[PDB]
Amino acid sequence: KVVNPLFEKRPKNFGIGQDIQPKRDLTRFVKWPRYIRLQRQRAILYKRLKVPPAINQFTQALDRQTATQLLKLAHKYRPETKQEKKQRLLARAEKKAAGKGDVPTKRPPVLRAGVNTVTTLVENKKAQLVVIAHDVDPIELVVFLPALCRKMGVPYCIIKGKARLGRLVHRKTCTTVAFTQVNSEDKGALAKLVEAIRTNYNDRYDEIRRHWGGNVLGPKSVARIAKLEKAKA
Amino acid sequence: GRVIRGQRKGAGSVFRAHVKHRKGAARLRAVDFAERHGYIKGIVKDIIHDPGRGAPLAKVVFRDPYRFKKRTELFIAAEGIHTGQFVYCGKKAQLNIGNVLPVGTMPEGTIVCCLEEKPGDRGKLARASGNYATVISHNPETKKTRVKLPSGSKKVISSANRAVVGVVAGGGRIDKPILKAGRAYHKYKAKRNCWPRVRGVAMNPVEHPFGGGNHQHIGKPSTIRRDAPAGRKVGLIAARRTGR
Amino acid sequence: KKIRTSPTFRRPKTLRLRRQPKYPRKSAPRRNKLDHYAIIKFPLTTESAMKKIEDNNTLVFIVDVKANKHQIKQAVKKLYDIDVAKVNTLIRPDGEKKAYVRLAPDYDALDVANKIGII
Amino acid sequence: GAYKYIQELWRKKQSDVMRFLLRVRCWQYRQLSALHRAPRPTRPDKARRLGYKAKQGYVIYRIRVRRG
RNA sequence: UCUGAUCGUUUUUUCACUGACCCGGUGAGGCGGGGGGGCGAGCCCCGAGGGGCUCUCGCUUCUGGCGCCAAGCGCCCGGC
RNA sequence: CGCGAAGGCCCGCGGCGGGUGUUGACGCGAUGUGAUUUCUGCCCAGUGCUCUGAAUGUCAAAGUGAAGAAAUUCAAUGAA
């Protein structure tokens, strides 16, 4: 850069009594709407209080790379929707008179959504996979379902998000899903999952029961603990 | 009977405070970053008289360091403070009269006034017309300090709470006999409006169980428990002793 | 920016819509109950209003209680096809708003008086 | 179905889901009133056993009274 | 006769943590860690080249003045 | 004579309620005597007020043991 005639640098001094402080982020200090300080500290309590094993077993979740494999399989076996159930219903009814075809046929395998439908097909030993949303709103809705799956001999896996389990189906959210039957081509793909799912969830179920969470004190509170214990060290 | 005078002094009525003409509160300033680690410099614009108080305040003018305007306070004025003076405020502001700095960074034996109780309440202790709290001996572990309040009771005050140096201006007030009934009247009219007391021994036996009789005599032992119900509790409360 | 520079959180203003009702709340606009023929009740004629009408070049009227001075001008102007310079309106003890209508210099307060019937 | 399991669980009270949860209840009755709308029951079975169904037109308010 | 202190219960006393709860400040404006940087200070070695450690600073106290709405630099893209 | 504010005196049917308090011991609150001058004697037995308390005489809900088949009976322990 060639020399400019009279262009000045003119810096600024920042500090106590010097020029006025700039406008920078106060993300930690802003008085938040007090409806979130409810929902925010609730994230902290579940880190502090001794969360019991029946609940804490909902943090340990199926990995990502395994999750996409399952979500691939569920993409093949989603239930029918409006606007094509409808058209098939248009195809169903209008063919009854002709005599060549008619309304109903055999039902190819599909998923099953509600916990009140899953369980009723679990204690009959009819469910192959059981997928549990890791964060159901009252967590009492599925706080009993793992220990039921082990006692009946069922592979069960926990996925992240009840909203995308609501995309394997076509509703806002779906607590649970369960495979009861599959077709012969994919039957290879299923056994690839349950051979690794049940090695981490069903097989070491006894490891999960003896587990307790919480007591992870705050970083301000724990850095002090380390510093003072360092002092005795 | 009826409620005695001093039993409706809590009803929140005629016995309120007379605070129409009072200039303002008396608080030092909120603790912020510039005061915690450095020191901020302010002018003493004008010293004024705050009615109902023998300790005249002082309009100190500071500068907000994170916006652009002029902020004003009402410090209790120490003694020696005069207008056009640069009052400092913080942790690294040296010792001199009328210049707040937190107890803990001031040497043992330094006289303070308008001392805070707990860090951040902007001045509560030893701020009458000419009183002063003395610092005694720090304890750089557990971060405490011991002050000798004006009464004489030694307090274990938390450190890091601030106190403007020097005695409070207006001292030596109660050395002039008021000398007049009226001159005491004008004094108590400017404050909570409760001046002319009438002894219990004079009122008929409804108010003040003391009263009544045919000789204007108390009749009852003066000293009273503090479990006594609200309405008998008159006279020398909870007397640990009496007599000269 | 406007992400975080101030230490307060305020309500984020949103979009607003105006009423688009699927029917009118009421059937049809309610016609006036206060028109030309109701805000000028009748001319007044006494020994005061006759001096007022022959000398000051003004008229006198009696007018409904709720009527501006801006409204009385229009009524007399439209009623008798006349002009008005200024209007003064006291309200009598009985409760009728007496109105003094100063007449424009281009007109003759007697010749208008004969038309409206008062002598 | 799950409701029998839910029913047999809340019989065994003395949990923490009830202690994790009072704080949710005890605070936000000041951020809003001591009478606000819940979006959906925090007890699914009990609401249903009492007459509540899940269709349109049903509301569920949480209300906080003081003991003594 | 004391034969570990292990996983287990409780009567426990003393101290410590904070998450329940309470108080105070505020326009909730720089809190707890980790290094960049040093007018300097020191602790220590060390080929005088430097290397390891501890202190400090948002670095201002004769003046009733002024102080925001970025200069500078770095990287893109558009018109003509 | 009380009181250093999780305080004194007090209002209140009730709340993170209210007055003194836009206050802080040269202050608020409760009394008695009655300008100044000159003095304010003896009694802590009585009636009050307050101060402390382990070896504690009396001492009520819980709580712990003993007998009974149980309701219960008994005992130790025992705050102000």
Token digits for B233? 């509790």
CA A177 – CA A113 distance, rounded (Å) = 5
Shortest CA distance from C10: residue in chain A: A33
DSSP 8-state class, residue B116: -
Window 88-107 of chain B: CB closer than 7 A to strand F? none
Query: Which residue in the set B38, B63, B64 is minimally distant from A15, CB to CB?
Result: B38
CA C117 – CA B92 distance, rounded (Å) = 97
Q: Specify whether the CB–CB gap between B168 and B133 falls below 8 A.
A: no
CA D29 – CA C38 distance, rounded (Å) = 60
Nucleotide E56 C1' to residue B41 CA (A) = 22
CA B28 – CA B100 distance, rounded (Å) = 8
Q: Which amino acid is at B217?
A: H
Q: Which amino acid is at A23?
A: K
CA B66 – CA C5 distance, rounded (Å) = 11
Q: Specify whether the CB–CB gap between B90 and B36 falls below 8 A.
A: yes
Residue with tokens 């006692």: A151
> CB of B16 under 7 A from strand F?
yes
| Lateral strand order in the sheet of B154-158 | B101-102, B162-165, B111-113, B133-139, B144-148, B154-158
CB contact under 8 A, D16 and A52: yes
Q: Does D39 touch chain A (CB under 8 A)?
A: no
Query: Which residue in the set A23, A24, A32 is minimally distant from C9, CB to CB?
Result: A32
DSSP 8-state class, residue A135: T
Shortest distance, CA A116 to any CA of chain D (angstroms): 5
Q: Which amino acid is at A116?
A: N
C-alpha pair distances (Å), A223 with each of A28, A46, A205, A219, A228: 19, 20, 34, 6, 9
Residue with tokens 């979130």: A36
3-state secondary structure D22-51: HHHHHHHHHHCCCEEEECCCCCHHHHHHCC
Q: Does A25 touch chain C (CB under 8 A)?
A: yes
Q: Specify whether the CB–CB gap between A13 and A19 falls below 8 A.
A: yes
Q: Specify whether the CB–CB gap between B30 and B122 falls below 8 A.
A: yes
Q: Specify whether the CB–CB gap between B93 and B107 falls below 8 A.
A: no
Other Cβ atoms within 10 Å of B43 Cβ, number = 17
Residue with tokens 């069922």: A154
Q: Specify whether the CB–CB gap between B98 and B109 falls below 8 A.
A: no
Other Cβ atoms within 10 Å of A45 Cβ, number = 14
Strand blocks (E) in C2-119 = 42-43, 58-63, 84-89, 97-103
C-alpha pair distances (Å), C52 with each of A147, C55, C79: 106, 6, 20
C-alpha closest to that of C77 among C53, C95, C102: C102
Report how far apart the first and last C-alpha atoms of chain B are (Å, whole number). 34
Q: Which helix (H) or strand (E) holds A75?
A: helix A64-76
Q: How was this structure determined?
A: cryo-EM
Q: Specify whether the CB–CB gap between B87 and B39 falls below 8 A.
A: no
Helix pair angle (A64-76, A187-197), 10° resolution: 150
Residues near B189 by beta carbon (within 8 Å), at least 6 away in sequence: B18, B195
Q: Specify whether the CB–CB gap between B40 and A16 falls below 8 A.
A: yes
Residues near A147 by beta carbon (within 8 Å), at least 6 away in sequence: A54
CA B45 – CA B62 distance, rounded (Å) = 10
CA C112 – CA C52 distance, rounded (Å) = 13
C-alpha pair distances (Å), C118 with each of C43, C78, C84, C105, C111: 7, 19, 18, 20, 11
3-class state of residue A59 by DSSP? coil
CB contact under 8 A, A138 and D43: yes
CB contact under 8 A, D31 and A148: no
CA C74 – CA A15 distance, rounded (Å) = 71
CA B146 – CA B137 distance, rounded (Å) = 6
CA B9 – CA B20 distance, rounded (Å) = 19
C-alpha pair distances (Å), C69 with each of C76, C89, C99: 11, 7, 9
Q: Specify whether the CB–CB gap between B137 and B156 falls below 8 A.
A: no
Q: Sign (positive/negative) of CA torsion D11, D16, D20, D26?
A: positive
Helix pair angle (D19-31, A36-48), 10° resolution: 160
CA–centroid distance for B192 within its chain: 15
3-class state of residue B8 by DSSP? coil
Instruction: Name every chain A residue with its beta carbon within 8 A of the beta carbon of B37.
Output: 16
Shortest distance, CA A119 to any CA of chain D (angstroms): 6
Token digits for B111? 């006289």
B130 conformational bin, left if phi > 0, alpha if psi -120 to 50, beta if neither: left
Instruction: Name every chain A residue with its beta carbon within 8 A of the beta carbon of D39.
Output: none
C-alpha pair distances (Å), B110 with each of B40, B104, D35: 21, 11, 56
DSSP 8-state class, residue B234: -
Token digits for C24? 């009118």
> CB of B215 under 7 A from strand F?
no
Q: Which amino acid is at B235?
A: G
Contacts 24+ apart (CB under 8 A), A102-111: A108/A183, A109/A77, A109/A179, A109/A180, A109/A181, A109/A182, A109/A183, A110/A77, A110/A78, A110/A79, A110/A80, A111/A74, A111/A77, A111/A78, A111/A79, A111/A168, A111/A169, A111/A177, A111/A178, A111/A179
C-alpha pair distances (Å), B86 with each of A178, B20, B89, B93, D2: 77, 31, 10, 11, 75
C-alpha closest to that of B27 among B92, B104, B123, B93: B123
Token digits for B4? 């005695």
**A80-89 CB burial, b ≥16 within 10 A, e <16:** eeeeeeeeee
CA C43 – CA B229 distance, rounded (Å) = 82
Query: In chain C, which residues are followed by a C-to-N distance beyond 2.5 Å, i.e. a gap?
Result: none
CA A181 – CA A107 distance, rounded (Å) = 11
Instruction: Count A/D contacts: CB-CB distance under 8 Å.
Output: 52
Q: Which amino acid is at D11?
A: R
DSSP 8-state class, residue A140: G
C-alpha closest to that of A177 among A187, A192, A186, A164: A164
Report the neighbours of D using a cutoff of 3 or more CB pairs below 8 angstroms. Answer: A
CA C24 – CA C71 distance, rounded (Å) = 30
D18 burial (CB, 10 Å; 0-12 / 13-18 / 19+) is: exposed
3-class state of residue A210 by DSSP? coil
DSSP 8-state class, residue A225: H
CB contact under 8 A, A17 and B65: yes
Residues near B71 by beta carbon (within 8 Å), at least 6 away in sequence: B61, B62, B63, B64
Token digits for C79? 């009623």
Token digits for B198? 């009438």
CA–centroid distance for A48 within its chain: 21
3-class state of residue A64 by DSSP? helix
CA B118 – CA B124 distance, rounded (Å) = 9
For B159-225, the DSSP string reads SS-EEEESPBSS-S-TTS---SHHHHHHHHHSSSS------GGGS-TTSSTT--SSS----S-S-B-
Other Cβ atoms within 10 Å of B181 Cβ, number = 9
> CB of B48 under 7 A from strand F?
no
Shortest CA distance from B68: residue in chain A: A20
- In degrees rounded to 5, what are phi and psi of residue A162? -85, -5
Please state whether beta strands A129-133 and A156-159 pair in parallel, antiparallel, or not at all (unpaired): parallel
Residues near A26 by beta carbon (within 8 Å), at least 6 away in sequence: C4, C5, C6, C7
Q: Specify whether the CB–CB gap between C35 and C63 falls below 8 A.
A: no
CA D33 – CA D43 distance, rounded (Å) = 21
Rg (CA), chain D: 14
> CB of B178 under 7 A from strand F?
no
